[PDB]
Design a protein around this ligand. Structure first.
Ligand SMILES: *[C@@H]1O[C@H](CO)[C@@H](O)[C@H](O)[C@H]1NC(C)=O
Lengths: 50, 98
């Protein structure tokens, strides 16, 4: 089924423009965000950074 | 559809576009307006005689070849199309690492 999967992935980017967001003039894009902090690094006091 | 119309417009704009030539290559100079939105000045070192600043450096010019009169909205394209337009060769003379 590698042929069928390749034909799906090829039909998927057929005529795709990656310079236009989904719903460019007809809607507003809704990006749902999430964060999983794997490690809270060392807080440097001199540079006031973390 | 509106999306297909915009895609056709953009493809027409970038077709036959010469990046080697600035706007008005054989005419008057192009006017590039600068803006700077300084986010922070991090460190002012006396031992290296330098200072680090983070800014939102914006430039605005007028390219007649990227002019469209089909859609009435101000297009915002992906940041990867800037590799296919002409952008002025601005450099900071007294920078060391940026
Ligand atoms: C495009 O930008 C100009 C200047 O910022 C503004 O006057 C105009 O309303 C904008 N167009 C749209 C469709 O918002």
């Amino acid at each position: 089924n590698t042929t069928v999967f390749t034909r799906i992935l090829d039909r998927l980017l057929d005529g795709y423009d990656n310079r236009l967001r989904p719903g460019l003039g007809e809607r507003v894009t809704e990006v749902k965000t999430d964060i999983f902090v794997t490690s809270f690094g060392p807080v440097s006091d001199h540079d006031m950074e973390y | 559809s509106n999306m297909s119309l915009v895609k056709e417009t953009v493809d027409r704009l970038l077709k036959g576009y010469d990046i080697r030539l600035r706007p008005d290559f054989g005419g008057p100079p192009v006017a590039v307006g600068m803006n700077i939105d300084i986010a922070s000045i991090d460190m002012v070192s006396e031992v290296n005689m330098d200072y680090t600043l983070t800014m939102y450096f914006q430039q605005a010019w007028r390219d007649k070849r990227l002019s469209y009169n089909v859609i009435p909205l101000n297009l915002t394209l992906d940041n990867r199309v800037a590799d296919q337009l002409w952008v002025p060769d601005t450099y900071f003379l007294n920078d060391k690492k940026s």
